[PDB]
Amino acid sequence: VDDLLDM
Amino acid sequence: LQHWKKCDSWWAKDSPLETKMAVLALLAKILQIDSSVSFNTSHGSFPEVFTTYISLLADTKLDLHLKGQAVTLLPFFTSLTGGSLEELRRVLEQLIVAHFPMQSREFPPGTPRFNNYVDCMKKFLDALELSQSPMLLELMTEVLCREQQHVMEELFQSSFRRIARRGSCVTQVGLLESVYEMFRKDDPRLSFTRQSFVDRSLLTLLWHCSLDALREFFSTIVVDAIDVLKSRFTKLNESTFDTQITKKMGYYKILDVMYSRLPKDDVHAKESKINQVFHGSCITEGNELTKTLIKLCYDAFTENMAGENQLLERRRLYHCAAYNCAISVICCVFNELKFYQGFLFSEKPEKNLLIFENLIDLKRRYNFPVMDELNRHECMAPLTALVKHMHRSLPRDLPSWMKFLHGKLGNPIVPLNIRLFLAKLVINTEEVFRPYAKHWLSPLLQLAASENNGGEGIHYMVVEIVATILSWTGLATPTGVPKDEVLANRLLNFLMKHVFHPKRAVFRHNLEIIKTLVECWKDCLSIPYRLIFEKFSGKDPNSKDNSVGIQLLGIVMANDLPPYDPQCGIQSSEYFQALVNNMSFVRYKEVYAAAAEVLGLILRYVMERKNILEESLCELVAKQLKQHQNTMEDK
What is the DSSP track for B228-256?
HHT--GGG--SGGGHHHHHHHHHHHHTTH
8 Å CB contact between B315 and B245: yes
On chain B, the residues whose CB falls within 8 A of the CB of A1 are 343, 346-348
Spell B481-494 as b/e; 16+ CB within 10 A means b. Answer: eeebeebbbebbeb
Put simply, the answer to whether B347 touches A1 (Cβ < 8 Å) is: yes
Phi-psi category of residue B43: left, alpha or beta, with phi > 0 → left and psi -120 to 50 → alpha: beta
* Coil vs helix vs strand at B411: coil
CA triplet B401, B403, B404: central angle to 5 degrees?
70
The Cα–Cα gap between B498 and B491 comes to 11
B271 forms beta bridges with B285
How was it solved?
cryo-EM
Put simply, the answer to whether B339 touches A6 (Cβ < 8 Å) is: no
Q: Pick from B291, B341, B346: which is nearest to A6 by CB? A: B291
Put simply, the answer to whether B295 touches A5 (Cβ < 8 Å) is: yes
On chain B, the residues whose CB falls within 8 A of the CB of A5 are 291, 294-295, 298, 342-343
Which of B288, B329, B341, B343 to substitute to test the interface with A, most A CBs within 10 Å?
A: B343
Put simply, the answer to whether B291 touches A5 (Cβ < 8 Å) is: yes
Q: Which residue of B has its CA nearest to A6?
A: B291
Other CB atoms within a 10 A radius of the CB of residue B62 amount to: 15
Distances (CA, A) of B406 to B354, B403, B486, B542, B607: 11, 5, 19, 48, 49
Q: Which residues contact B96 (CB under 8 A, 6 or more apart)?
A: B143
The Cα–Cα gap between B85 and B135 comes to 8
Q: Which residues contact B440 (CB under 8 A, 6 or more apart)?
A: B399, B403, B426, B433
8 Å CB contact between B533 and B582: no
Spell B565-590 as b/e; 16+ CB within 10 A means b. Answer: beeeeeeeeebbbbbbbbbbbeeeeb
Which of B289, B298, B340 to substitute to test the interface with A, most A CBs within 10 Å?
A: B298
Nearest to B143 by CA among B162, B172, B123, B163: B123
Other CB atoms within a 10 A radius of the CB of residue B181 amount to: 12
Put simply, the answer to whether B291 touches A4 (Cβ < 8 Å) is: no
The Cα–Cα gap between B415 and B138 comes to 44
Put simply, the answer to whether A4 touches B339 (Cβ < 8 Å) is: yes
The helix-helix angle for B169-184 and B153-165 (nearest 10°) equals 130
